[PDB]
Design a protein around this ligand. Structure first.
Ligand SMILES: Nc1ncnc2c1ncn2[C@@H]1O[C@H](COP(=O)(O)O)[C@@H](O)[C@H]1O
Ligand SMILES: Nc1ncnc2c1ncn2[C@@H]1O[C@H](COP(=O)(O)O)[C@@H](O)[C@H]1O
Lengths: 246, 253
């Protein structure tokens, strides 16, 4: 015969990058299902930790060990911050609030405020959900952002390039630095910047600083060689990359 | 005065000795204590209270055989209509909304995982939940929901897990019977007269709405309330995600 679209996409979903796997569709599907169920049975028997959660924790350990303060800010923020971010893809909620499309606005308020109680340099970071009406191969609507930044005198690209390297070296991911765009192949892993920037004026930040934002789903995409980033995202359709529609 | 009192309670900490000293002098002493606390934290801690508790709770459950779940926060509006709600919902756009609870997604995982895992199916999620709201309620809170599905799951197992859980977190509690129409004979996990969690033993009518036929037990705890008890916070806003507090310390210094 020849697989119909519906059957190819179906095999696609049940397929795993590590799969060793002609044969008719029903046999291919039956065998792949059997494997996926076993893969799930293994995770349940040995691991049990969710990829998204586990990586978040590992990333948190790294930064917390390197002197960064772990921030947990609101996901539902005032629409003002979006304006204040010089934004003239957003999920609006109610009257003047929305779902944070980035971690920057809330981190800015922490840099400013903390800058009055903590000695330079101020090192903070946050890992969490961000939303953007979106190319499900690199982009999701609900993704997880890692944002870190250090504020104080002397902060430079060098400093920045240092953390990014120790970081990705730690995670165990290849990369290529090329504002900076931490690339892995041609997949953008992160967007980093060396302060100060005009926008700093909009939030009361008057010291130089360095920061980078990474998408944990892309880190996972690369770490587990997923074709579709959705396999790394929050969903009820995949668990640690294993289809749940079995 | 009134306004002075308010900004004083904001800088006042639970562990402080807290009468007649002039305001300026009182505010000053608190501002320095707060920066000191915030400085000790930045030097020896650095872990968000919410994040740390989540990580501790996660280890507790993964170690007892529960699978860790991370599901969408932005869920389909129908899941709400499906839970039996026709409320304080943050609708976003056409037909989506910020989950007001974890039940729907966990219901789906139970249904799907039952086709691949041997009973008992044990899962749990920890994450953001939303409800439009004061001294005990946040609009944006953090929920922990765990449940086991499979025959055998009795009220006994439920009370036993909660007990090991709260014993591990070192949180004194009382479990009182509660009864309502939709959920039936429920379990209230109390600390004084503050509710820590609602615990239910399935099956219940609502189940058929999600493709679940088997019995189960589950309970949901709000982390902020767990924090509020552990740290003896007066206002639950001390533990919530916010730009005004950090581990219960005012950031306006
Ligand atoms: N829509 C998205 N879906 C998934 N990840 C994203 C998305 N947008 C951004 N990211 C991740 O966050 C990084 C920085 O995004 P940004 O600086 O806002 O352009 C990107 O390089 C990705 O690592
Ligand atoms: N608005 C809220 N703010 C903080 N915690 C909450 C809130 N709603 C529920 N919780 C916590 O979650 C538990 C169960 O909530 P429910 O979904 O109504 O059964 C409550 O007893 C609290 O422990």
């Amino acid at each position: 015969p020849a697989l119909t679209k519906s059957q190819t996409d179906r095999l696609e979903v049940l397929l795993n990058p590590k799969d060793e796997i002609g044969k008719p569709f029903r046999e291919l599907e039956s065998e792949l299902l059997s494997r996926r169920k076993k893969d799930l049975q293994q995770i349940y028997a040995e691991e049990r930790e969710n990829y998204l959660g586990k990586l978040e924790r590992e990333i948190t350990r790294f930064f917390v060990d390197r002197g960064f303060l772990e921030i947990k800010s609101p996901i539902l923020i005032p629409l003002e911050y979006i304006e204040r971010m010089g934004i003239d893809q957003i999920f609006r909620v109610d009257k003047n609030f929305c779902l944070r499309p980035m971690l920057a606005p809330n981190l800015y308020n922490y840099l400013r405020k903390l800058d009055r109680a903590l000695p330079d340099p101020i090192k903070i970071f946050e890992i969490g959900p961000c939303y953007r009406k979106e190319d499900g191969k690199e982009h999701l609507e609900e993704f997880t952002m890692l944002n870190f930044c250090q504020m104080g005198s002397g902060c430079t690209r060098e400093n920045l390039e240092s953390i990014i390297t120790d970081f990705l070296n730690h995670l165990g991911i290849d990369f290529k630095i090329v504002t900076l765009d931490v690339m892995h192949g041609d997949l953008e892993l992160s967007s980093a910047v060396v302060g100060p920037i005009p926008l700093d004026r909009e939030w009361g930040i008057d010291k130089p600083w360095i920061g980078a934002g990474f998408g944990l789903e892309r880190l996972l995409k690369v770490k587990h060689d997923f074709k579709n980033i959705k396999r790394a995202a929050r969903s009820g359709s995949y668990y640690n990359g294993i289809s749940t529609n079995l």
